[PDB]
């Protein structure tokens, strides 16, 4: 066979140890998921410094906690925009999931609160900036550097999916680089606990699996499709289904035809054809062998999965660090007021937040 006796035994033991880890991780998650802990704060506990990014509903801002002096990233959501875009349950999903998870590549939530106008989620500040910026600046990553990042996403999805969580918004914009050059996934705006199928049309056009676009009840395999899009974009510099308007993007995704740059290795193309697979009975991450089809693929042969988890692998890139509140790795955005109305808005809709 492909593996000699020793290698086969080692791999088998490693895969069993993953099962043991995940069983314990699930116990820990459910304890927090069922009886969540208080993490309250209020707006005047923080100094607002700079807008780090924008989204729907508001911004992410660098803030400074007045008492401790610690810097944080504060996601602000205007409640009236959330209710109109029927993003109420998604925002509740986001908070509850962030509160309960624990993994080295998932950003850590510190506080959550609300006022008359807004919802607030305060998390660890990740100063190295978005993968997106670094990727656009350099053009494309080498296959070894793309692989280093990809491995972290594979482990992160192995963790999330074991908890019945689907992530649903993988893209370089949502992957921050920390001081050691490792990834922090942020933004859990579309994450959801799903036992089998779910039906909401959501995500980012370039990263949507065909079954989302086709309004089919879909499952966690949409995240493995999105991993294929991410790996392609990291290694090429542009995504596999690339067009000016969402409707044209969707047409390309549903056709399913992928073309690869001539510099892609054969190993990489094979992995990507198996991730960017329209047929769910054939898509890696959705078969009997589960995540092992991905982790044991030739393109990952040089990946030491435990060393990645332990963060003992030398990162390809270490971000410029200029102090705990330095924002040099982020682009500039228009600074808008944080309005807090005298009157409570949408109190009914956000009681459980």
């Amino acid at each position: 066979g492909h593996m000699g006796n020793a290698a086969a035994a080692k791999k088998g033991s490693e895969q069993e140890s993953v099962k043991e880890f995940l069983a314990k991780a699930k116990e820990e998650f459910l304890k927090k998921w069922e009886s969540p802990s208080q993490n309250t704060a209020q707006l005047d506990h923080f100094d607002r410094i700079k807008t780090l990014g924008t989204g729907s509903f508001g911004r992410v801002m660098l803030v400074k906690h007045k008492e401790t002096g610690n810097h944080y990233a504060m996601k602000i959501l205007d409640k009236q925009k959330v209710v109109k875009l029927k993003q109420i349950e998604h925002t509740l999903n986001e908070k509850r999931i962030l509160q309960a998870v624990n993994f080295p590549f998932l950003v850590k939530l510190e506080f959550s609160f609300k006022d008359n106008s807004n919802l607030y989620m305060v998390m660890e500040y990740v100063p190295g900036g978005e993968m997106f910026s670094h990727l656009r600046r350099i053009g494309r990553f080498s296959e070894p550097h793309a692989r280093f990042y990809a491995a972290q996403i594979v482990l992160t999805f192995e963790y999330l999916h074991s908890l019945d969580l689907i992530y649903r918004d993988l893209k370089p914009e949502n992957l921050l680089i920390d001081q050691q050059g490792y990834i922090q996934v942020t933004d859990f705006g579309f994450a959801k606990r799903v036992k089998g199928r779910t039906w909401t049309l959501c995500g980012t056009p370039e990263y949507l699996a065909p079954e989302i676009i086709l309004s089919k009840g879909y499952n966690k395999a949409v995240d493995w499709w999105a991993l294929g899009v991410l790996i392609y974009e990291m290694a090429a510099g542009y995504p596999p289904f690339f067009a000016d308007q969402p409707i044209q993007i969707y047409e390309k995704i549903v056709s399913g035809k992928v073309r690869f740059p001539s510099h892609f290795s054969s190993d990489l193309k094979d992995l990507l054809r198996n991730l960017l697979q329209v047929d769910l009975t054939k898509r890696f991450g959705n078969l009997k062998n589960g995540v092992n089809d991905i982790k044991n693929h030739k393109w990952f042969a040089t990946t030491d999965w435990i060393a990645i988890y332990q963060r003992k692998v030398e990162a390809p890139f270490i971000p410029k660090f200029k102090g705990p509140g330095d924002t040099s790795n982020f682009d500039d955005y228009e600074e808008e007021e944080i309005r807090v109305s005298i009157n409570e808005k949408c109190g009914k809709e956000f009681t459980e937040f």
Partner: peptide, 15 residues
Amino acid sequence: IAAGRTGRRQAIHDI
């Protein structure tokens, strides 16, 4: 010739 979105991409909440 290829053409597509190079800037940050916003999520969609419906299609």
